Amino acid sequence: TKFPKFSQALAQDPATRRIWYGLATAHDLESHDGMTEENLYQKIFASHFGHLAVIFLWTSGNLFHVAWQGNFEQWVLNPLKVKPIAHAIWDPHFGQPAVKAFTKGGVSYPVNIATSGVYHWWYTIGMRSNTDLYAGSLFLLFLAGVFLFAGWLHLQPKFRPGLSWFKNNESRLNHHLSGLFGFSSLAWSAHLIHVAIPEARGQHVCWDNFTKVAPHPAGLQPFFTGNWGAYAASPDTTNHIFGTSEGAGTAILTFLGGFHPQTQALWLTDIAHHHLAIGVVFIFAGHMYRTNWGIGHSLKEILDAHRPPGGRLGAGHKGIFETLTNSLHFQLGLALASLGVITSLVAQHMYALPSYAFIAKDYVTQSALYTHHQYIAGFLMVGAFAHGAIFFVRDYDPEQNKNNVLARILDHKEAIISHLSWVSLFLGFHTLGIYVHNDVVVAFGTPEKQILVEPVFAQWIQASSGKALYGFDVLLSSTNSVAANASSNIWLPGWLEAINSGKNSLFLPIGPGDFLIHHAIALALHTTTLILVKGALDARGSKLMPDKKDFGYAFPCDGPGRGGTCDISAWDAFYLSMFWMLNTIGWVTFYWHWKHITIWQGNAGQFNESSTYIMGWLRDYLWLNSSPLINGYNPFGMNSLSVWSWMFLFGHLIWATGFMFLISWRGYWQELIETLVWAHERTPLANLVRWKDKPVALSIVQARLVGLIHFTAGYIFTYAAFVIASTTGKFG
Amino acid sequence: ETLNLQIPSPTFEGSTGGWLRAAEVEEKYAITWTSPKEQVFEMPTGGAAIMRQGENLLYLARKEQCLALATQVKNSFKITDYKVYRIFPSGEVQYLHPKDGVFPEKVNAGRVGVGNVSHSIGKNLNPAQIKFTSKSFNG
Amino acid sequence: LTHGYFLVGPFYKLGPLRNSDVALLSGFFSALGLIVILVACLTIYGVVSFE
Amino acid sequence: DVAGLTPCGESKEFARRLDGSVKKLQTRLSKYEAGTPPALALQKQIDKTKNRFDRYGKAGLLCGTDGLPHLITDGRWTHSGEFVIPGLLFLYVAGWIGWVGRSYVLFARTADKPTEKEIIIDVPVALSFVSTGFIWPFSAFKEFTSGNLIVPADEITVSPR
Amino acid sequence: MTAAYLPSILVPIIGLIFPGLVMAFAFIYIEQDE
Amino acid sequence: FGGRGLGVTVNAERWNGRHAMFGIFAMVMTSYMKGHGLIPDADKVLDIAQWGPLAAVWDGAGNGISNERAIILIAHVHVLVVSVIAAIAPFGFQDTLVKEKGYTPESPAGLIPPFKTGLTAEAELINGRLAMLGVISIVTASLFTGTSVVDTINLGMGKILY
Amino acid sequence: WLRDFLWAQASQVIQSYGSALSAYGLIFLGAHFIWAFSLMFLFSGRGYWQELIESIVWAHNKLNVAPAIQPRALSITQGRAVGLAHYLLGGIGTTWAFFLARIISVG
Ligand code: CLA
Ligand code: CLA
Ligand code: CLA
Ligand code: CLA
Ligand code: CLA
Numbered sequence A: 001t002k003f004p005k006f007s008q009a010l011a012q013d014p015a016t017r018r019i020w021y022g023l024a025t026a027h028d029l030e031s032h033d034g035m036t037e038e039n040l041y042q043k044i045f046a047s048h049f050g051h052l053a054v055i056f057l058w059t060s061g062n063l064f065h066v067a068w069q070g071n072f073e074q075w076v077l078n079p080l081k082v083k084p085i086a087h088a089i090w091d092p093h094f095g096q097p098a099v100k101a102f103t104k105g106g107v108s109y110p111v112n113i114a115t116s117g118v119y120h121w122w123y124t125i126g127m128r129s130n131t132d133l134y135a136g137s138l139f140l141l142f143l144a145g146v147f148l149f150a151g152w153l154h155l156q157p158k159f160r161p162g163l164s165w166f167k168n169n170e171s172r173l174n175h176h177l178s179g180l181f182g183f184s185s186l187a188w189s190a191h192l193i194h195v196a197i198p199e200a201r202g203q204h205v206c207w208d209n210f211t212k213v214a215p216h217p218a219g220l221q222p223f224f225t226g227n228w229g230a231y232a233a234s235p236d237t238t239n240h241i242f243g244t245s246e247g248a249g250t251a252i253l254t255f256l257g258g259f260h261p262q263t264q265a266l267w268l269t270d271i272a273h274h275h276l277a278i279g280v281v282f283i284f285a286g287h288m289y290r291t292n293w294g295i296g297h298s299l300k301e302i303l304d305a306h307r308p309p310g311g312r313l314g315a316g317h318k319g320i321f322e323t324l325t326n327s328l329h330f331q332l333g334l335a336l337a338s339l340g341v342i343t344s345l346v347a348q349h350m351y352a353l354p355s356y357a358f359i360a361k362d363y364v365t366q367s368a369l370y371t372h373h374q375y376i377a378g379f380l381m382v383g384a385f386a387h388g389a390i391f392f393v394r395d396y397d398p399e400q401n402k403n404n405v406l407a408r409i410l411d412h413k414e415a416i417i418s419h420l421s422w423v424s425l426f427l428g429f430h431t432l433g434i435y436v437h438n439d440v441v442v443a444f445g446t447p448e449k450q451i452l453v454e455p456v457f458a459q460w461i462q463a464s465s466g467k468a469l470y471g472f473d474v475l476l477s478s479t480n481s482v483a484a485n486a487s488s489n490i491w492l493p494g495w496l497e498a499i500n501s502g503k504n505s506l507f508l509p510i511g512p513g514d515f516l517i518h519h520a521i522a523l524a525l526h527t528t529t530l531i532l533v534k535g536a537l538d539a540r541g542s543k544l545m546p547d548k549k550d551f552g553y554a555f556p557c558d559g560p561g562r563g564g565t566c567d568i569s570a571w572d573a574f575y576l577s578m579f580w581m582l583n584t585i586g587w588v589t590f591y592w593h594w595k596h597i598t599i600w601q602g603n604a605g606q607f608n609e610s611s612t613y614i615m616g617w618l619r620d621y622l623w624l625n626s627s628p629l630i631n632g633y634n635p636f637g638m639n640s641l642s643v644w645s646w647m648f649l650f651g652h653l654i655w656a657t658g659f660m661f662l663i664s665w666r667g668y669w670q671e672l673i674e675t676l677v678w679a680h681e682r683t684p685l686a687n688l689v690r691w692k693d694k695p696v697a698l699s700i701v702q703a704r705l706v707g708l709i710h711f712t713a714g715y716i717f718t719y720a721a722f723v724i725a726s727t728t729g730k731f732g
Numbered sequence B: 001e002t003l004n005l006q007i008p009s010p011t012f013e014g015s016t017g018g019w020l021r022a023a024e025v026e027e028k029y030a031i032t033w034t035s036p037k038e039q040v041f042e043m044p045t046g047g048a049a050i051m052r053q054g055e056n057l058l059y060l061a062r063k064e065q066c067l068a069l070a071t072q073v074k075n076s077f078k079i080t081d082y083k084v085y086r087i088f089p090s091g092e093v094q095y096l097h098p099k100d101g102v103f104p105e106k107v108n109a110g111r112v113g114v115g116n117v118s119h120s121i122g123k124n125l126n127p128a129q130i131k132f133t134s135k136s137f138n139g
Numbered sequence C: 001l002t003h004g005y006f007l008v009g010p011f012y013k014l015g016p017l018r019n020s021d022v023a024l025l026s027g028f029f030s031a032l033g034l035i036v037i038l039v040a041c042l043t044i045y046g047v048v049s050f051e
Numbered sequence D: 001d002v003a004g005l006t007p008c009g010e011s012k013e014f015a016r017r018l019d020g021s022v023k024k025l026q027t028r029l030s031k032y033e034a035g036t037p038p039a040l041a042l043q044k045q046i047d048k049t050k051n052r053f054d055r056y057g058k059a060g061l062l063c064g065t066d067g068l069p070h071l072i073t074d075g076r077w078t079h080s081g082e083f084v085i086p087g088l089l090f091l092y093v094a095g096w097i098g099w100v101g102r103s104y105v106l107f108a109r110t111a112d113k114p115t116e117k118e119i120i121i122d123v124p125v126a127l128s129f130v131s132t133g134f135i136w137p138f139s140a141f142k143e144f145t146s147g148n149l150i151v152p153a154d155e156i157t158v159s160p161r
Numbered sequence E: 001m002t003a004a005y006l007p008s009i010l011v012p013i014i015g016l017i018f019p020g021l022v023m024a025f026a027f028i029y030i031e032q033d034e
Numbered sequence F: 001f002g003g004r005g006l007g008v009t010v011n012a013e014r015w016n017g018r019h020a021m022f023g024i025f026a027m028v029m030t031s032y033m034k035g036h037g038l039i040p041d042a043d044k045v046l047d048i049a050q051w052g053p054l055a056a057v058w059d060g061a062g063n064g065i066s067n068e069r070a071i072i073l074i075a076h077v078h079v080l081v082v083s084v085i086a087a088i089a090p091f092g093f094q095d096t097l098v099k100e101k102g103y104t105p106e107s108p109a110g111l112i113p114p115f116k117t118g119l120t121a122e123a124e125l126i127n128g129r130l131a132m133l134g135v136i137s138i139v140t141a142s143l144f145t146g147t148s149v150v151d152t153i154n155l156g157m158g159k160i161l162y
Numbered sequence G: 001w002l003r004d005f006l007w008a009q010a011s012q013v014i015q016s017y018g019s020a021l022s023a024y025g026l027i028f029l030g031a032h033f034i035w036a037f038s039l040m041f042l043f044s045g046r047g048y049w050q051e052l053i054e055s056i057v058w059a060h061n062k063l064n065v066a067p068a069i070q071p072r073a074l075s076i077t078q079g080r081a082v083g084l085a086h087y088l089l090g091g092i093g094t095t096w097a098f099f100l101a102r103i104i105s106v107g
């Protein structure tokens, strides 16, 4: 009767709904009883420090478990042959065949083999021994403690920040651009130049010697003379064996481009020069805003003055400053949309341009990292649109936003939504129709009749960056071009070697199957956007429910009247778009993984011929690659893919269990539960035990969430088991 | 006015759909009505019972259970003589329906309007306006 | 006395260590562990249910 | 040629596609006697397969490394018969259907009971309308400019937001 | 492995005692009224 | 929770005192016990074939718990079952771990309880505070100096145990 | 059941293309499609589709091509019935195609 102490409406509920709803509304601090704005921003600040610490404890845990139980020192000796160990297994349910089957990695105990790539990342950035992985784990435990104490400290009465501090947009932007983005990128260049570059070249540099070991033989004298090009002189040779002194140069900043020939990763001197460039740029960008000394920009002044004189945007951005600052949901939506695009950039640029030594030969790690970050990307992008819907319901004031960009977006909400409906339908009808055309014609024994459309626009883009496969002779592909001549002395020789060589995932060859799947991804991104945009724009009202704002973000329905109002809330369009997010990241990761496993065999033509129809995707990707995974255990034994073999079935179960919450709805279950309440009260020896909370069926919104969680968890666990076990079992 | 606890009840052979421990520990509802006949009706909680000629008394676990029987008795047997009471475990009897002797669908003097909003529904305040202030969204 | 007496048998006969010579000791310990979990359940029910 | 593709008439992979596709049917024909109805049917299938590959070879289509025809749809006029010209034929028929249906819903609004005209179609009038579609680009553009296609924003029901 | 005893000591504690105890306490806290 | 004698209370101080005096006894007793080799087959590694996967340890040699460690654990399990039975079903006279919600918390002892030479509560609390501190002293001494806890117990008492 | 029954015996439907059993491969894929398409009607509710139809009705009103029989999202019961009908058709058609290509090839 007092668990949701933040909610008296839930704390007086006599049912089991109180526990569920108190657990599910716990982090929605804005909705808590008697919540002021001061207390809202100060609890968010302290709980952001708790998230900071959880991240640091998670990273310290990965470092500790690899330092303790991993084979990092064995792996760094021979990184292409040794399989990295994540942590050991102590499971009292194992049989002795299971214990023997997981005893890989060169150790004497069962282990999980790491798919996270942390070995390649820690190898590349300098770590050599278990002592420094452990030292990193210790330092992160200290930092986690520092940020937990900071979270407690900024909850103390003298140390409580005011709302004037929390909304100082200019000082926060100045410091996050110049200190958090820029100076830490500059400090990361210092780590590469001072530690990672020398230790990639055999010379150990630690805290014990880094003030008496110069990164460059000349040493901070060329920098303080303008002779900066002396830091690019004598780069690492193509004969360099990573981690050793043979083939090593003395340069610490280069723009060679392409990849280190042995590790098949970006040059660490390119990465050090990248973070130096991006650091200075971000530091300069962090001097943009006026704080205390009269130079800089006021964000209010910039936003108010950007109204085009033609009047096409109305009042423009007048009043957008206040809306953004006052609305934490508008900020969360901008932050999550921005972050979601970046983790999609992270997934796309880390497989094509890997930075870590001897990764991109760890095919399981490449598949897991790409799949992981694309799923994180889809979650962040859907959440951005969710919090835009929450912004419109909760924080958007139409009077304060008269004729703005925001009001005028709502004014044409139907033009936006109907054109997203058109483009979704357009793409879906044709992409599916071309795929079905191809399936029917191939089935009828006539593969030639297939509508195979070359991806010429993308091929032109590849050629424009120097791919010579398509013979476009555009820009970099043409030897005598202004673009080619300009970059010839700096990054083009390495880039042309990297792009033209077929040993890397840089600008991988694209054909008709690639075109069709890209259009499928376009239908998926447009359809998820349609559902999310329809939810955000119709969040505050619709013809079916004009006063939808008055009911909130997440409500079940408005009842069976007016024809029926199931899934009418903006939350329910989040709910419906979550399936479309899962479907699109499914199409993306299925495409990435199938194209890569076919290239990794040396059989890229198998994707080229089978991806243009859907039975090729069914038999040649899902059915063909299932066999190492589903044979992880059988009546003839088991091997170390048994865990993924069990997880794959576990994902199928959770996913299907989600269907129970999504297909079967409340009234059936409340009528079951009332017969169980009768039976418990009428059973002798059992009616001595009484519930404190009346058993009720799950709510309409709660069951939609429970089915969505089960569907999503089943989706993730099934695909993670498949993408890891098929790649591990195949090794290619 | 008060519930006469001695009113005889309709002939029901019992059912499992009746009231549970919350009726004897939280609240119970009773419905009384006068019938001109010895006639069979359907229980809200199950099968069929026979209402006796004269005055009948029922014990249900919900007010909707009472009002469901009230509608069945008014549409099929034309009884308009139904009084719905909420009986606390303390023994307090609370008269409920019709609350002032006249049905809610008929106007009655001395009824004060509760929940009435002076404007139409499209003039409700936006949630941003009522955020971080105690002011209500109905204007 | 009733419940503890019959709990030992399923753990002993059908447990992981059933084929071992320590099957009865494992079954008793498993029964005892289940008794401790159940007695914790009885304790927590008593704390919350009854004023 | 275009996009590193080869014309289908000189690609060896298209030729081995045709040869394999004819061998599959010839081994099905090898189990039947000459004048029998299955053999006659199979031979006509072989003739159709050869005609398809012969026509595709001389059509200017470009084959891939897989020996299947690929469509170039970037707008170039040497390949306009694969998307730009079939697309113009589509847009003419699609705009025909759209103009004809729009004309019929505007007719049906001016009826005594408008909704019976949409479940029981006035077939002579609807056939008058299906004949109207052959000059839909001009009819629809004159409709657009004469203020009869687009209704103003203040004549359309919208949600309160 | 060094400290090989710790997985045998902690994994049953973290995996059985920790949930049991925190579930028991969570149950007491959610059910309690004052 | 706190209103039942749990937390930083004198009831908890007394109970942890009792457990630390018993623990100092048990540490001294196991030091004497394995110094003379009176634990049978102390080095013998238990086989997973008899005991199952709970016996696995992952120490590079043997891959199993030793018999000594299992025997000390079984001694602890004996007194844990006594502990649970005493916690849930105490004696009529015994002090109870969880005091009734409405109880009178005993006054805090202070810096030093009054000295009574008999079997008194004050003597129990003094010895208990000393033993809890003693547990910390031995655990830190062994940790700091890189010696087995059994060995530092033996060293403190002048090797009387062994 | 996953490996030795569904995966092992679905070999014939997946590899049926270019043969006389290619219709079963097409119905196998088509029924997987119909089954999945059913879940659009099963996991969603009418109110989403009516507000989406409102935006589409706006686009029709803008071109003066609104129908006189006002488009509605299907009823709540009909959304359930359409989802169940497509689910049964998709599942049974998947099993129908799988069973028939498997046993025509091997039996
Ligand atoms: C230089 C000064 C400075 C610095 C360093 C910070 C730093 C920070 N502040 Mg800020 N802050 C400052 C001044 C500063 N503050 C001032 C002056 C004010 C008052 C006006 C504030 C007011 C303020 C508020 C109100 C809040 C913060 C918060 C935060 C934290 C952000 C959370 C996080 O982890 O992001 C870390 C972000 C990065 C490391 C950069 C992101 C990198 C981008 C996204 C992509 C780069 C990818 C790159 C390859 C990384 C690869 C990693 C590796 C695995 C490959 C962060 C620690 C928030 C917080 O969490 O509270 C603790 C918060 O709520 N600050
Ligand atoms: C295979 C599964 C599947 C398929 C095909 C679809 C298809 C579609 N969904 Mg649905 N959806 C699904 C699963 C599926 N969904 C699931 C599981 C969920 C989670 C609940 C959703 C949730 C969802 C939402 C919330 C939304 C969609 C939307 C869409 C549309 C997006 C593509 C588009 O706009 O045009 C593509 C059109 C097609 C693919 C239709 C196929 C064309 C047909 C088959 C022609 C065949 C004619 C033939 C003769 C019929 C024979 C019948 C016989 C009895 C005579 C389309 C109708 C969005 C929408 O309506 O945007 C406009 C939208 O808002 N879907
Ligand atoms: C011929 C009549 C007609 C016309 C002119 C339009 C016009 C339009 N519709 Mg379509 N629509 C129609 C019928 C029609 N609709 C019907 C019957 C349905 C139910 C299936 C829909 C469902 C529909 C959806 C779901 C969407 C549109 C959209 C659109 C707009 C974009 C154009 C487009 O891509 O069409 C697309 C057309 C379809 C997807 C369905 C085509 C339906 C058939 C082919 C037409 C029916 C022929 C009709 C029976 C003719 C009978 C007349 C005869 C008696 C003389 C535009 C306002 C889109 C929009 O709002 O974007 C701005 C959109 O998302 N419409
Ligand atoms: C947060 C990251 C994290 C994660 C997921 C794990 C995961 C695991 N650890 Mg732990 N561990 C971590 C960090 C982490 N470790 C750190 C930083 C240390 C250094 C002190 C250790 C030291 C450690 C030891 C010594 C042992 C494990 C063991 C294990 C395994 C069994 C669980 C167990 O007995 O835990 C016991 C873990 C601890 C007592 C240390 C606490 C772990 C972190 C710091 C807690 C952080 C919690 C998280 C941030 C948020 C909690 C709330 C959450 C429920 C929402 C399991 C693989 C056992 C093992 O390897 O068996 C194979 C084992 O014996 N861990
Ligand atoms: C995540 C951690 C975890 C761990 C470490 C264990 C540990 C164990 N499980 Mg597993 N189990 C778990 C989770 C876990 N379980 C979950 C989540 C489930 C549900 C899916 C199961 C379901 C399960 C089954 C169905 C069985 C086991 C069995 C076993 C035992 C291994 C077999 C053996 O050697 O028998 C020797 C085992 C013993 C001698 C039993 C020792 C009894 C302990 C020591 C008493 C502990 C007292 C108790 C925890 C008090 C807690 C009170 C509460 C407040 C915490 C071992 C005790 C088997 C078993 O019970 O063994 C008989 C068995 O049949 N487990």
Ligand SMILES: CC1=CCCC(C)(C)[C@H]1/C=C/C(C)=C/C=C/C(C)=C/C=C/C=C(C)/C=C/C=C(C)/C=C/C1=C(C)CCCC1(C)C
Pocket: A047, A049, A050, A051, A053, A054, A057, F139, F140, F143
């Ligand atoms: C989700 C969550 C909830 C609320 C909000 C939140 C706070 C922000 C967030 C954070 C959660 C977080 C950050 C949770 C963090 C949880 C953590 C860090 C748990 C760590 C546990 C470590 C243990 C139990 C080790 C004990 C070691 C011992 C006893 C060794 C002792 C010893 C040995 C043998 C050797 C030395 C001597 C002695 C002393 C004898």
Ligand SMILES: CC1=CCCC(C)(C)[C@H]1/C=C/C(C)=C/C=C/C(C)=C/C=C/C=C(C)/C=C/C=C(C)/C=C/C1=C(C)CCCC1(C)C
Pocket: A329, A330, A332, A333, A334, A337, A341, A381, A384, A385, A387, A388, A389, A391, A533, A536
């Ligand atoms: C719903 C909602 C309600 C209101 C609040 C809200 C939260 C804000 C909102 C959410 C909105 C959301 C969730 C919005 C999400 C918005 C997103 C994801 C926008 C993506 C923008 C990407 C751009 C502009 C890429 C540009 C690349 C370029 C120009 C590359 C150029 C090039 C370069 C340099 C290199 C290559 C060559 C070329 C190609 C020339």
Ligand SMILES: CC1=C(C/C=C(\C)CCC[C@H](C)CCC[C@H](C)CCCC(C)C)C(=O)c2ccccc2C1=O
Pocket: G040, G041, G042, G044, G045, G046, G049, G050, G072, G073, G074, G075, G076, G078, G079, G080
């Ligand atoms: C897509 C969808 C709609 C919209 C679907 C509509 C409006 C159906 C319209 C489809 C076109 C207009 C006709 C369908 C014709 C098909 C090509 C074949 C139909 C075969 C029989 C109808 C004869 C709902 O109304 C709905 C309601 C409740 C739960 C889920 C949903 C749901 O998922």
